[PDB]
Paper text:
Herein, we report cryo-electron microscopy (cryo-EM) structures of Delta and Kappa variant S protein trimers – both in the unbound state and in complex with the ACE2 receptor – to gain insight into how their mutations underlie changes in ACE2 binding and antibody neutralisation escape. Finally, the P681R mutation (present in all B.1.617 lineages) immediately precedes the furin cleavage consensus sequence (682-RRSR/SVA-688), with initial reports suggesting that the P681R mutation enhances cleavage, and consequently S protein post-fusion transition.
As for the Kappa variant, the Delta variant S protein–ACE2 complex focus-refined cryo-EM structure also reveals limited sidechain rearrangement at the RBD-ACE2 interface. The Delta variant lacks the E484Q substitution which preserves the E484–K31 electrostatic interaction, while the common L452R mutation may increase ACE2 binding by enhancing electrostatic complementarity. Further, the Delta variant lysine substitution at position 478 (T478K) extends its positively charged sidechain towards an electronegative region on ACE2 (centred at position E87). Analysis of the electrostatic surface potential of the ACE2-bound Delta variant S protein is consistent with enhancements in electrostatic complementarity afforded by both the L452R and T478K mutations. Compared to wild-type and Kappa lineages, Delta variant spike proteins show modest increase in ACE2 affinity, likely due to enhanced electrostatic complementarity at the RBD-ACE2 interface, which we characterize by cryo-EM.
Numbering used by the authors:
A (entry chain B): 330 to 530
B (entry chain E): 19 to 614
Write the structure that this text describes.
Amino acid sequence: PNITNLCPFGEVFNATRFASVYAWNRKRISNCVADYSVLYNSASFSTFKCYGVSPTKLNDLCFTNVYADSFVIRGDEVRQIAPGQTGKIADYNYKLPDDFTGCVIAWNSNNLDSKVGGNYNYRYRLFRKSNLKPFERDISTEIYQAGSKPCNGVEGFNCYFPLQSYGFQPTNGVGYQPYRVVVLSFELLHAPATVCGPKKS
Amino acid sequence: STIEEQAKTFLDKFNHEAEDLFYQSSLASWNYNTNITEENVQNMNNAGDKWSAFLKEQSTLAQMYPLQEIQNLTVKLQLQALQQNGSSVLSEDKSKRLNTILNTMSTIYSTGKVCNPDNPQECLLLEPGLNEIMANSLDYNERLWAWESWRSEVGKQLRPLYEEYVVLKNEMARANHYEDYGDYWRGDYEVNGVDGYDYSRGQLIEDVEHTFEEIKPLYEHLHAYVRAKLMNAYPSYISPIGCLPAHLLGDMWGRFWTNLYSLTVPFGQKPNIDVTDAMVDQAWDAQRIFKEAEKFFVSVGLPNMTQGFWENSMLTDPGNVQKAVCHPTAWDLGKGDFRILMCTKVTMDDFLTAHHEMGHIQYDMAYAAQPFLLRNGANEGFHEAVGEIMSLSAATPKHLKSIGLLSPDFQEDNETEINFLLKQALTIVGTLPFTYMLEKWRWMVFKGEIPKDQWMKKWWEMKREIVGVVEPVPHDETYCDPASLFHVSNDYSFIRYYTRTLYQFQFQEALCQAAKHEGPLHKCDISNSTEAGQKLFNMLRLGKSEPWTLALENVVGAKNMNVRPLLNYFEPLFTWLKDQNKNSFVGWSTDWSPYA
Ligand SMILES: *[C@@H]1O[C@H](CO)[C@@H](O)[C@H](O)[C@H]1NC(C)=O
Ligand SMILES: *[C@@H]1O[C@H](CO)[C@@H](O)[C@H](O)[C@H]1NC(C)=O
Ligand SMILES: *[C@@H]1O[C@H](CO)[C@@H](O)[C@H](O)[C@H]1NC(C)=O
Ligand SMILES: *[C@@H]1O[C@H](CO)[C@@H](O)[C@H](O)[C@H]1NC(C)=O
Ligand SMILES: *[C@@H]1O[C@H](CO)[C@@H](O)[C@H](O)[C@H]1NC(C)=O
Ligand SMILES: *[C@@H]1O[C@H](CO)[C@@H](O)[C@H](O)[C@H]1NC(C)=O
Ligand SMILES: *[C@@H]1O[C@H](CO)[C@@H](O)[C@H](O)[C@H]1NC(C)=O
């Protein structure tokens, strides 16, 4: 059968602006045809690490829904987007489950997300009382209490603001350059699976 | 909850908001250095003021966490570094007076112009007007005139200023729980809290004297040989039994003896190892020089330079329209940005300098994983030593033959090794008594052992006793002869060169033993050895996280600075000098026998 209504991967990968890692965008992709070979055959991605499934059989399998989480992190923090990892991003910003099925795609964005004066529009949660659950979003802006003393609302001594900005310059090293990360999460639920791969003739 | 967790969160907050500010300050400094314009000066000053104010505010917040309730060594080290008052403990009036004194000394040294009386229409500055005269002239009275005139003008201007400087610095140091300013400088080598690896501030002077006592026979033989050659060059001024005249050492102050290689060459008939013509014939660009240095560092196993290094560094002089500082400097700007600012020419010296500065870059890159306030060398000596070892290894004839710059049929006989070792001794061994005497004199001045009215009578007495250099004419207390040098006039520690020199050969013996070199130490090359690079990188990766004693254990297997690798390096030269000094008299007399 002739196939149309392809999945909206243009609005995730080719977005003009990406979200901050504290407020990572989640897009639910359903009832369309997902061509994953366009992404896999691209040479523009630095990390294409798939956990729980292989890229070759993605174009054959069918899934109920696809979750596309999009955010921006540093070069040295891409390793923390993996199951079982520990760091600022994993504990306080974006937590991946151990039993995760999907792919983590990351690419360098020094061209767009870095300006000569410094791009400070991207923020990360530096302190939280407890670690995040998998696929949890924390957009709270309440002052972190590191000491028994009551913070009382003001950022003074032992009480810090949890969201800290990121500094992006075009002359930075590859471990400090901004990297756009799109994490695709594939789940199979009891409902009939509608995100199927293209059928070859 | 606990104090240690509070300090850890505070240190995280510091490292995060301090790396970006340091990057802004460093980038502004880079923009000033590659582009000397008044707006760039203003931007640099604004960034520096923001950086200093932020450090003051963070230190003020940092002091509220007591040191004795923290057990983690890294957290304690960062808190110790942050909690230092510095000049903040002193009163605002005295702090402003101290800053004004430092700035005016900087201007007096930098803009000091001296010329001959009765001919004042034009005058010569120190660089390069006086440097070339001191390094190349063979006339006794001309060098005497230049030396005495520069110490007359600079010392008479700087003597009250230095008298105020010592008192203010002592006041700040005693306000900061130190005995004197010398104890403050010696506190860089202080290690506390580690069992067995502890190092005291008082142990540094004892170790320096103990090492110098072993340095002294080699220096005495070298001094006798230099005295005989200078006696040949100047027939009547130099005495066989006395010290060397001060203005004849080839430099303005006596810091290096490398300008006497032409006068004191052992075998002039034999060729040199100059490779400048070979690079000129093959059209070696500065980019090729840095690529060959990169090839050397990948040969030993270290990581190669980043793309940002090649894109953002200035490795050639920009041009007439754009002004830049010509001094070669390796910049660790922060956030993984490493650059080299060098006006590279096609010379051997620039090639070795490229290796030295890329060694500085490699050292800076290695501790990038460490927290921000621990991103330094373990002491002031290691940072220079890791560049000097690359300078040592790259200058060897085996390295030059390996990279094609030297002919494969070049004859390496003993005579070339002797003259090369003598040049290395004039550069390296000759600076050690001057450095030790200068630091010991400054430590005694800060300690109050020498009263202000007796500074020069002791100083020349020290110079005759240690350096074996006599004053041409007596100087009274109106002179300020030490402060004519760049480091002392601008508030810099001077013992780093002595520690660097000993650490250089200790590291060289350790890496050559790792690389399984089977010949003389000076013929050793650390290229192609992965294990030597791994042994070096184990110390390189630590940075300031671990004590310098533990780092030295990691490399050479010793818990203290040692003098034996230097003596082993110059052992062929030591035997040759002992053979050549049979007729002449080793040692000097402190009396006024040559001239006064
Ligand atoms: C996204 O951008 C790249 C580069 O401009 C382009 O080649 C590609 O076709 C775009 N779309 C997708 C779905 O990757
Ligand atoms: C140096 O400063 C001048 C001043 O106008 C500017 O025109 C030029 O572009 C600058 N060059 C660099 C390399 O920054
Ligand atoms: C000290 O703290 C660092 C992080 O702040 C931690 O990784 C390290 O294990 C600690 N050291 C000790 C001995 O607890
Ligand atoms: C720094 O100075 C302040 C005020 O003079 C003092 O309270 C503090 O103890 C000093 N810091 C140290 C480490 O002594
Ligand atoms: C640096 O080394 C890596 C791996 O050894 C290599 O891929 C890269 O091309 C090198 N960089 C340059 C500029 O040659
Ligand atoms: C160099 O070696 C030759 C050959 O043994 C010897 O005759 C000569 O004395 C040596 N010279 C020096 C300075 O070692
Ligand atoms: C080190 O390795 C390079 C790469 O093959 C080689 O050309 C060079 O000759 C080696 N050095 C020595 C001393 O053999």
